[PDB]
Ligand binder design. Structure first.
Ligand SMILES: CCn1/c(=N/N=c2/sc3cc(S(=O)(=O)O)ccc3n2CC)sc2cc(S(=O)(=O)O)ccc21
Ligand SMILES: [Cu+]
Ligand SMILES: [Cu+]
Ligand SMILES: [Cu+]
Length: 502
């Protein structure tokens, strides 16, 4: 196993515009196969990256900035990871989805709006080359990645992930740490071969003779953890307050972070932006696609080496010497100036201030069947991706979604376009529900903790519970999607279309 904490943390450069004016900002990003060293003792690794970078460059915009990004495919015609042709036409398809973006439907990166190299071939839902991001939403941590039909888990694992930040000039008065002291942290677990090449399972453990090859796997757990493209890195920090945009860009793995010196995290934001009130945390869970906007005060730890630790297991308990480690902070950098940043308690207006009428209430269940090969096929409400759309909210209206989870594992449920509030969680008799379809609660409703009292777009739906959320579908109408963000699940039909009707 690679030696931990020997490479410094890379800080992705901020992408510079091809053209910019007061009325518009135009960017160009090209997907390319490239090589990068992920660790001091590894040979270079072959990856796929936006502008040839892993992670891709960080994009910074202001609220309401009129942005355009021309995402281009200039990758090889053949993939380098195991493709299962039985779960679903050029071999390499790509489409960029701005996760968390309030985007017009033809710029949202629909799974079937893919395109091959140079846009030679395009999916049935392709409409445009240059994506449009009006950015008329709250300041927040967004991130972009590939979303191609049936290839999402592979393209993302290949390295197609990047951070996107929306800055709301009105929040500047909070004086939160900024600039050099505002650092994004993209966490991705990977398994790397001796030759430095990426390893992605070609099939499940002990493959059945009647199983396809390659064969998609229901989940993926890497043996190594990276942050911003480097294995267990270290970051030199000044003894003061820092802001971190934590992003889980992993296929399956869920993290449960904490600091080994017992220090606290100060959560100031969730997927949807600033929380109404800051929350002191000793630890926090972060499933795939979830984002935590936090402040860490290093002021009193000058000289110390602090480890960002993980206690959540993935396909087993955490290994103290490996996946139990994320990165290491080193409070040894001299202060460049006085720490003028603040860690205010009053961050933003409450979401509950809004009083919307409940137009509809959808009850959805997390299930699945089994294919001809004996493999599990996860389905949202027992429907397949290709079946006729069923989740059809009306633009401008608010609905309550009740997600029933009779499975034995947690599912990070994500809805495109919108941001939503969490109402509560409640346990139920799984056996009963599975045998009679009847839902019987075995305890009271549990309201969300301070962490989920803001706006979320990716939410954890625990096993044996019913999760209720509320969302106002808009401002745009069109064809979008909602799905589990565990890529291995998403690619084998745990994804459904979502039509916001007008
Ligand atoms: C319902 C799930 N579906 C499977 N894949 N899903 C997975 S893989 C997975 C890994 C983690 S981890 O870090 O994030 O360990 C957490 C949650 C996970 N889930 C969702 C629970 S495997 C299966 C077997 C049966 S049984 O009836 O074959 O005989 C029935 C249904 C099945
Ligand atoms: Cu996403
Ligand atoms: Cu899932
Ligand atoms: Cu998505």
């Amino acid at each position: 196993t690679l030696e931990k904490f020997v490479d410094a943390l890379p800080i992705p450069d901020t992408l510079k515009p091809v053209q910019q004016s007061k009325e518009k900002t135009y960017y160009e990003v090209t997907m390319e196969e490239c090589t990068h060293q992920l660790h001091r003792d590894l040979p270079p690794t072959r990856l796929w990256g936006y502008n040839g970078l892993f992670p891709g460059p960080t994009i910074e915009v202001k609220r309401n900035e009129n942005v355009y990004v021309k995402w281009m495919n200039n990758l090889p015609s053949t993939h380098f990871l195991p493709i299962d042709h039985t779960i679903h036409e050029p071999e390499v398809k790509t489409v960029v989805h701005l996760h968390g973006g309030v985007t017009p439907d033809d710029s949202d990166g629909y799974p079937e709006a893919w395109f091959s190299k140079d846009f030679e071939q395009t999916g049935p839902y392709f409409k445009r080359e240059v994506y449009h991001y009006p950015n008329q939403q709250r300041g927040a941590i967004l991130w972009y990645h590939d979303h191609a039909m049936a290839l999402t888990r592979l393209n993302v694992y290949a390295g197609l992930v990047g951070a996107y930040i929306i800055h709301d000039p009105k929040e500047k008065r909070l004086k939160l740490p900024s600039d050099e002291y505002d650092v994004p942290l993209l966490i991705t677990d990977r398994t790397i071969n001796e030759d430095g090449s990426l390893f992605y399972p070609s099939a499940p453990e002990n493959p059945s003779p009647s199983l396809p090859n390659p064969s998609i796997v229901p989940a993926f757990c890497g043996e190594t953890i990276l942050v911003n493209g480097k294995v267990w890195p270290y970051l030199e920090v000044e003894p003061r307050k820092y802001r971190f945009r934590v992003i889980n860009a992993s296929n399956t793995r869920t993290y449960n972070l904490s600091l080994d010196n017992g220090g606290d995290f100060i959560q100031i934001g969730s997927d949807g932006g600033l929380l109404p009130r800051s929350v002191k945390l000793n630890s926090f869970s972060l499933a795939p696609a979830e984002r935590y906007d936090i402040i860490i005060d290093f002021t009193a730890y000058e000289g110390e080496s602090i480890i960002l630790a993980n206690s959540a297991g993935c396909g087993g308990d955490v290994n103290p010497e490996t996946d139990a480690n994320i990165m290491q902070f080193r409070v040894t950098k001299p202060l460049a100036q006085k720490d003028e940043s603040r860690k205010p308690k009053y961050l933003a207006s409450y979401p509950s201030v809004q009083h919307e009428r409940i137009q509809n209430i959808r009850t959805l269940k997390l299930a699945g069947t089994q294919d001809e090969y004996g493999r599990p096929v996860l389905l949202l409400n027992n429907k397949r991706w290709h079946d006729p759309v069923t989740e059809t909210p009306k633009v401008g209206t608010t609905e309550i979604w009740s997600i029933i989870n009779p499975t034995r594992g947690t599912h990070p449920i994500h809805l495109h376009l919108v941001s939503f509030r969490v109402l509560d969680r409640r346990p139920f008799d799984i056996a009963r529900y599975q045998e009679s379809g009847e839902l019987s609660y075995t305890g009271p409703a549990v309201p969300p903790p301070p962490s989920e009292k803001g706006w979320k777009d990716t939410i954890q739906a625990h096993a044996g519970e019913v999760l209720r959320i509320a969302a106002t579908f808009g401002p745009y109408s069109g064809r979008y999607v909602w799905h589990c963000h565990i890529l291995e699940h998403e690619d084998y039909d745990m994804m459904r279309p979502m039509d916001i009707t007008d």
